[PDB]
Amino acid sequence: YVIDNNLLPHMGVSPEDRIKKAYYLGMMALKVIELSLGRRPEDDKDHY
Amino acid sequence: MIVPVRCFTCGKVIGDKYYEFKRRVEAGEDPEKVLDDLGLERYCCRRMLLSHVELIDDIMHYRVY
Amino acid sequence: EDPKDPGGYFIINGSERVIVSIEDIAPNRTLVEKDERQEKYIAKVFSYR
Amino acid sequence: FKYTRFEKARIIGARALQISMGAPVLIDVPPGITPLEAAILEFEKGVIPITVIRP
Amino acid sequence: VQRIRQDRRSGKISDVINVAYYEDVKEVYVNSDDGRVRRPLIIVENGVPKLTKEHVQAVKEGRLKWSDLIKMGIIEYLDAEEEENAYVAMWPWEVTEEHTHLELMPAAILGLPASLVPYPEHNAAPRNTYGAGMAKQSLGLGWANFRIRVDTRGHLLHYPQIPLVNSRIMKAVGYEDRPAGQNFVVAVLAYQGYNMEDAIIINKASIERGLARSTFFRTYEAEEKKYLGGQTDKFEIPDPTVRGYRGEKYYRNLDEDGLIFPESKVEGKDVLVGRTSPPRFLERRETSVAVRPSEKGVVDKVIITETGDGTKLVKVTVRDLRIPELGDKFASRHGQKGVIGLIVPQEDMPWTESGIVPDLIVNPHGIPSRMTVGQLIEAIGGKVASLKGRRVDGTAFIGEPEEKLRKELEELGFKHTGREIMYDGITGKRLEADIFIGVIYYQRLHHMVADKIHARSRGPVQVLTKQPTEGRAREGGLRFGEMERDVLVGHGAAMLLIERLLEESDKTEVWVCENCGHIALEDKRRRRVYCPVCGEEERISKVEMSYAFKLLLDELKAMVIRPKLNLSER
Amino acid sequence: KKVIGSIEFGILSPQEIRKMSAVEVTVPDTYDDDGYPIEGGVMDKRMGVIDPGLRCETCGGRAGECPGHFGH
Amino acid sequence: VSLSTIKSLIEKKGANLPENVKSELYEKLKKYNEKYKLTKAEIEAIIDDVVKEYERALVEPGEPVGTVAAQSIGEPSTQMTLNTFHYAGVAEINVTLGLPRIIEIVDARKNPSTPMMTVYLDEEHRYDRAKAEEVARRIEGTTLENLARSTTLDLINFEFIVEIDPERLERSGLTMEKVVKKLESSFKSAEFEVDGYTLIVRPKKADKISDLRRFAEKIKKHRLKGLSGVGKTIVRKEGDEYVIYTEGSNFKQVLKVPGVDPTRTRTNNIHEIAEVLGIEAARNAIIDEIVSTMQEQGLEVDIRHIMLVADMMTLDGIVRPIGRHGVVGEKSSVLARAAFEITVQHLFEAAEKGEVDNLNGVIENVLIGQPVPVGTGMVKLTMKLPLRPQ
Amino acid sequence: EFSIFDHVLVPEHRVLSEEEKKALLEKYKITLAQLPQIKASDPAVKALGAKPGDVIEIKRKSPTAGVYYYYRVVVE
Amino acid sequence: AQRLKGKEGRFRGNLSGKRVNFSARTVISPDPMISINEVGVPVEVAMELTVPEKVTEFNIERLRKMVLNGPDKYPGANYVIDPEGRRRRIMDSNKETLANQLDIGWTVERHLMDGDIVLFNRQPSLHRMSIMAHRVRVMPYRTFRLNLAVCPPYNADFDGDEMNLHVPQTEEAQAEARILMEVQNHIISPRYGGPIIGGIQDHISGGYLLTREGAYFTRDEVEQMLMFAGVDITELPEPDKYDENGNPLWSGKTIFSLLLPEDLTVWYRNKLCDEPERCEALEKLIEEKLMPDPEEVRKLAYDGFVYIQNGKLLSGAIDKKAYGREDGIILDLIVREYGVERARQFLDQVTKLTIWVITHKGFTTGIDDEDLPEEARDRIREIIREAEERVNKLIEAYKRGELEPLPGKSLEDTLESLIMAVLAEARDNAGAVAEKYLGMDNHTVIMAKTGARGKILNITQMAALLGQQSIRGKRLYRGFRGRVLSHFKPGDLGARAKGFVVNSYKSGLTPQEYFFHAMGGREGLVDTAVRTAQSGYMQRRLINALQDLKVEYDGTVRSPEGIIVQFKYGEDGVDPMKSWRGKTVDVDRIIVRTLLKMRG
Amino acid sequence: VTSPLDREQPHFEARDLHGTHWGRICPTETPEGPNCGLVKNLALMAQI
RNA sequence: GACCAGGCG
DNA sequence: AACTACTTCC
DNA sequence: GGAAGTAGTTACGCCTGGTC
Ligand SMILES: [Mg+2]
Ligand SMILES: [Zn+2]
Ligand SMILES: [Zn+2]
Ligand SMILES: [Zn+2]
Hints:
Strand content of chain B: under 5%
Radius of gyration of chain B: 13 Å
Largest sheet of chain A: none
Largest interface: E-I, 127 and 122 residues
Function (chain H): DNA-dependent RNA polymerase (RNAP) catalyzes the transcription of DNA into RNA using the four ribonucleoside triphosphates as substrates.
Number of strands of chain A: 0
Order of helices and strands of chain A: H
Order of helices and strands of chain B: HHHH
Helix content of chain B: 40-55%
Distance between the termini of chain A: 34 Å
Largest sheet of chain B: none
Number of helices of chain B: 4
GO biological process, one term (chain H): tRNA transcription by RNA polymerase III
InterPro entries (chain H): Arch_Rpo5/euc_Rpb5, RNA_pol_subH/Rpb5_C, RNA_pol_subH/Rpb5_CS, RPB5-like_sf
Shape of chain B: flat
Number of helices of chain A: 1
Oligomer: part of a larger assembly
Shape of chain A: elongated
Radius of gyration of chain A: 14 Å
Catalytic activity (chain H): RNA(n) + a ribonucleoside 5'-triphosphate = RNA(n+1) + diphosphate
Strand content of chain A: under 5%
Helix content of chain A: 40-55%
Number of strands of chain B: 0
Subunit structure (chain H): Part of the RNA polymerase complex.
Bound molecules: magnesium ion, zinc ion
Structural class of chain A: mainly alpha
């Protein structure tokens, strides 16, 4: 329940959307890794 | 609202001159020449005619009875 | 009514209520930043549904 | 003996409070004077019945 | 990305679509969501903007509309993401082949109240912020609908005026149809120290002729409430036999129906809707509606109507004429706030060799610390506009340059600096220095001293703490906070602290049992004082303490804490 | 008249609360339908009265004059 | 009038004067006697005027000095608008200044946000930059990662590769062999082979990859030289004297390294000053640090208020905060403590221990509505009854 | 070699005799509990032979009065 | 628990601070024609608030008259309380009977009248001068009035300010206020031992226009200004010059000297000292004998060296150094050597005199006050051009790796610090050129050099370049990636692209410079509120920690349980309010004063 | 336009003017006090 | 009575 | 939220 | 010694209106 509803609800709440949740989480992890390696700057929160 | 009877600064009566000034300016005459012809030489008096808004027409439509 | 009035508001129990826009963070977009405390890189997303 | 600010204030306040409850004025005062002004006149003249005690 | 934007400009793709790319990390972002703030720009290709003169002429003649220009791909909407990829030019003569967009109008980056300010780039940013914020508090004909509108409070400047130096945006928006303020003749000199410290000196003759005059509207509401069981209240002039009856003078203007006749002068505490409610004391109680204790006026309008549930409802509107007096707040569009420090007769005001008398005088000491050169430029422009008979364009960056205004003032027969030879009204000799004088658009704010003055000798108190109530509307008392307590302590004033914090808020007397320390009980029926905890009658004595401290003792005796009191002989 | 010389803080004993109280409250109600306080309720007149026209059963004082009394 | 008679008269008639006042009066009278011929009567009149003005300026008993000091410190803080300040120059050290600095000092922070020490030098190292940079090197704690030009890891062969800049090694004094010698004894079972200016580490006991990573972290974080807790060091000149400013804080270690002047070395950390030098030194450091912080912002506050605050802060033998866990928390009155911040906790704990509030303070007497024992509240009055108007 | 008393921050400390301590306590009409205290583990105390219950006179070298004597009791 | 704790709880909301009776609040307006210790009270407030006065032998007639007037007429009363404690509201069919039955021992709650003592308070209340006792002066209009010299203690600026007025009700409280809290006292700040109640802007500027070199006044002007100031005088001094028509003329220095003590003598350099050689010559003349020949001083008189001799102003011009919020030499000496009533009299007289001078002499500020010749404009233009070229060279060196880091910071920080240093130096040089070219006859310059209002930075920003804008001490960087606005090439580090505004306020800002200036103003306005909140919390902590500490009768400072905090307050026993700018005694001042008193 | 952040806290990065506000948010119109920078008004050229 | 919002210094 | 300080598991 | 948890605060007034 917390996987389907409470993790990445915008992807979906059906079990068919679990895999796309995995792809989105992998993309987020890739971004955080790139920040760890310094290949990208910090994301500004006041940037419109 | 409606044109002030007297200039706020020196008290010169400018109530009558506003409609003549408006119609002459709409006719295409030079505003400086019109204001000189009307007799308003001090710029305090010219401020009264040049910056006035006839707002009475826009509020006459609502009645209080 | 005043023809100059632009509308865009509600009348609730006789009072005029205007809804002010809220400057929220972009949904479904992940943002990366540094915690600077545990040397942990944090990437958060606000998923809306 | 030099009074401090606080001793002077207490003496004048006590004297004015006494005057407001019928204690006779120790000097001559102009008519219409408020009791506080009467006490201040009394202090400025120097006729001060109240004495401060120090440790 | 190029294909996307070319398709959008060709019209086959909707306007809402925006796309950007990032060479740094090789990512293309496409946005089609809602709530993106965007701005329009002119598309520039190969050093030539898409917009041309014939497009401008078509727009001017009404043949072409804004949506048309957006659809043809002439003007583009960009949010922050797409703007990141842009290289925007600010002026048409600055366009090069490397530029991607051209700014439609750099003066439109400001807000609407901020666009009210003329020559905003000649002012310090804090003063521009002050002026933009104070533009929303001025008095004027806000809406032509005000007469029949029912609103809790409202104002009406009797003679609004167009700003002589005004931005073109203010005419395009429609501010000219609803102006809020007047053009004053302002002299910048120090006069008797009454305009010192941002104070303002004003002309009595100008006020008496209608300058800054206004009317304040308040609408009181009274509903014939229908309680349970059919126990209704009634609109009527109550008989003196009803409970809570006010003086018979307060119902002087009422009609037999129970409503006050219109155009009848009403002063403080006079009733407008005589009303009686069913009794609930443990005769009919009174719940009539009267004007607020510090407010007077004339009854402008009385309407009667029916509520949503079907009960009768009446709205009464009272208008009070507010002629400017000492303490009323005045402001200019450049952030120069101030209150009227003095009202001077015309024969005491200085005059110019051209016969010009100021309507307002401002101390020069407020100019340099604030760095509002825009106000001086606006004064020059206002004088030039009055002399020419044409209003001066004061737009943010394309307005009339100050050099042109000075040259025009020189050609009109006046000193180019704006300084004029002035004479002292009191003594009759000309002042040694040439006085800077001009026309500045001043606006009267709704912070009137009549709406703020408050004084409370003694009145109602809160039930819980027996301390004075809070608020000007309910005879409240001013809070003597703990900061003022420390201020009093630092002065050594111990008896004044007692008088201010004990006698004048909640002084009371309590009975304390010396044997136990609890609070003794006084039986008013049996005429005895005793301690129920221990049954003592001889070791009982009064103490003097604030009612708030007795309440604190009660809340401490709750939650099971014993605050035993020890007494000393003094 | 006396002045407070010191305040000793302690924890009230059950016997202290029982003796200091003027009423034992049993009914979880405030007022009746007619508008009078319910005997045995939180607003019992033996704990003081706040509504004008009522009278206190412990002091006999009117609203605003009766200091108030404790219950358990 | 002889010059010794001047001092004789100062000691005779000015015995009721502070020592510094006597010294200043002596020096000034000497100078004015050198310039103008001062007679005996003028000298005696000057002495009488000095003593009268001193007696007139004495503080009045009952004065509420504490609240006046609190007000005179808190009020200028509203105009402490400078706050963060940046300076452009060859050698400057970052340091918190302004309102946050005053809040840090008055709150008695365990360690400031920007610890920093002022290190003076003895006569042997106070007149040449070359002789001072060596002792500054002796102070700065430098680890391998700081000295490294770059880092590199080879997990397959359990190899850790460290590229090292020759220039910063020339500016740190450590040679490559000098770098490796102590690293060898720091961690055993490692090859520690240096390849020119690119050191390589191959631990043999790192059976797992994570073991090699932990070894690399240990080697990088290990300090080769200097004193622990100390970072960047700079050198500045004043009065023909070279001094050192450090980015770290270690008072005793710095006072023990050769070449430093142990009679003038300072520290921003007040607690460390107290633990190394004593409570009086901590109080003096607090006073002068607050004075300097106020002076940097152009605000003028009297020294006496600072002295009162510092003496109240160091009254228990330790430096304690001004807030609820410090001077206020040590107040004897229960109601005074309960009025400040935490209220239910203080009342419940006071009821637990059965504390008594003797009402000897100001706050509680205000709460109850009785005279406060300050100012006019300390004046006892007496009066002879028979009054006879004139 | 280096004593903490040679530091410019540290003022000179000194232990008062019993007669001087009695005279001090009589002068201000105080008990030892009414004096400021200095910990027995304080470096200035340890540099002397002071033990808990003792009074230390400190020559503070004031900027306003030149010299100024401050007294602290030793506590555990 | 919520009933007790919290800022709205019992302790803070109803015990430490609580709402009070007999208080009033309204907008404050300036009034230079009332004394510093007086306040103008509206008739409405005076009629509303009352003072309980027990009727005695001497005030029976006045209280009878005010009972007869009743609550309607202003000099009237509201209530009458018999000795038994029964109170009766005065109304029609009661005034005559209550006036008849006034007797002695009754209480009459009368209206405020002139001379009554009240507490006046503008309540962000930081120091003890936020509340001072003022003498009531009843005024027609409905606003509080305040003398201009008393603004600095209250920090009031007549832009909508409101102040609370509390009326003490007991005779003890009235005496406490009138003795300890009156505005005559508290002229010297306890914070720094210097004058806090002094001239602010118009007093200083009018004093400079009065006492400056070549400033002369006609007989009618002199008589009018002396009468306006309240100075008592029956004969004018001998005139200094004679006009071309034979009209006598008085110097401003003589008029100013007419209101100084006849024994005062002091010398000092004020802010108007631009040529130190003349000041050194004057000091050398003075040091030889300490009583220089007045004509010899008049030969070497300078505007930057104030020299008063026996109450006669012989050289110098009135500045912020004469009297001001800080470092008022003359006011401090008058309040420390002649009393506190003399200081009040001198303050009132000098404020009125300077106000008259500045009013009838003319003081204005126009567009021409920011004008510079073509040479000054060209010099400033070359200054900015050289600064921009230097910044370009630094950027190019950093791009090629040519630049090497400064100690303590990286290459990027080294480049940033060097660029900011260059920009600040360029702004300083342009301001120096503007200062050289504008001159001392400009009214904007006059009020800035004399400290009346504004600094040199304001004139520099108004007549020359605005300078580099910055947030948190760094150059402007918040915006797009590699730039601030999308009107600059990404990766640009140039002067203009990072916030260096090259335009004056008079020249008008370009849109980019306007946005940069908006960012700077925003950072300042954001700083203000955070600073005030933090300062308020710290002040509350300090006050709650140091509330009760007091000086005992033996001279020590002791804690409530008797713990000795200080064996002598301030380690020397001198109150900072009574000290000489933090010093125990001004030894040199005393020596010079005594030597001039005897040898004179 | 309003921000959901609490007005009491010192949101230094959120109360300051951003370069992306150009043409989207008014650079000068903002209330004084606690709401400074957190309450914004739209520029006249802004389109949502 | 307490909650929210907007302002004022 | 963003700071501190304890506390308290480790 | 960590390394999390937990708790405790975060200027002072004043005004307006609107809903419970
Ligand atoms: Mg103000
Ligand atoms: Zn006119
Ligand atoms: Zn008992
Ligand atoms: Zn009862």
